[PDB]
Write a protein that binds this ligand. Structure first.
Ligand code: BS3
Length: 228
């Protein structure tokens, strides 16, 4: 783990790093949130912001220092502060931003700034490719409503990594965490749909746990069975 200011960076594969930021949240302790940084040839792609603009600007500083290539775009995986809290920092840096159309719709009422571009999805869950131009190895998938109605997930082609965001919890998690905006009826199915979308992925990266095996998917889905 590389400590960089108050953030933590962890290399997961030759061209993939996890970014981690913390929010000292009254009543819940200091909460970690994870996203990804992916180098694709001569550019960098970001999955999710940090909790704040200042933290997100530090992600961009780390990228400048450690990779020193332009950030082509960012994709954010739902309209909550842990994933979209730093949108203004991205926009100030001239980075093109993408989110689920529904996330952009929800952003203002969630207290977030919307991304510049809206992803739409086919019936089977795969992103409509015209809406995700120049995504390179990022394979975007809407698994159905779960942690939130708008949650999306991302696989990284050329690696064994898939990012479940806030939908997936680790294999030893006691609970599904914050269910305030969750769809309790569809959660288990959506977690299983994520696993089926990225069947070869052996490292599952998540918003609020360290990377785990596919046991995170099975455990998450089993816990979600009890919400029905
Ligand atoms: Bi969240």
């Amino acid at each position: 783990d590389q400590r960089f200011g108050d953030l933590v960076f962890r290399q997961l594969a030759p061209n993939v790093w996890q970014h981690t930021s913390y929010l000292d949240m009254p009543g819940f302790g200091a909460v970690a949130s994870n996203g990804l940084i992916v180098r694709d040839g001569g550019r960098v792609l970001v999955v999710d912001t940090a909790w704040t603009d200042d933290q997100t600007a530090q992600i961009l500083n780390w990228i400048k220092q450690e990779i020193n290539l332009p950030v082509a775009l960012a994709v954010v995986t739902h309209a909550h502060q842990d994933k979209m809290g730093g949108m203004d920092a991205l926009h100030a840096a001239g980075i093109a931003t993408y989110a689920n159309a529904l996330s952009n719709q929800l952003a203002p009422q969630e207290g977030m700034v919307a991304a510049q571009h809206s992803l739409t999805f086919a019936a089977n869950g795969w992103v409509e490719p015209a809406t995700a131009p120049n995504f390179g190895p990022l394979k975007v998938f809407y698994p159905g409503p779960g942690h939130t109605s708008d949650n999306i997930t991302v696989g990284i082609d050329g690696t064994d990594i898939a990012f479940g965001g806030c939908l997936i919890k680790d294999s030893k998690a006691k609970s599904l965490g914050n269910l305030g905006d969750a769809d309790t009826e569809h959660y288990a199915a959506s977690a299983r749909a994520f696993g089926a979308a990225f069947p070869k992925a052996s490292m599952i990266v998540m918003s609020h746990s360290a990377p785990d095996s596919r046991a995170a998917i099975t455990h998450t889905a089993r816990m979600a069975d009890k919400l029905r």
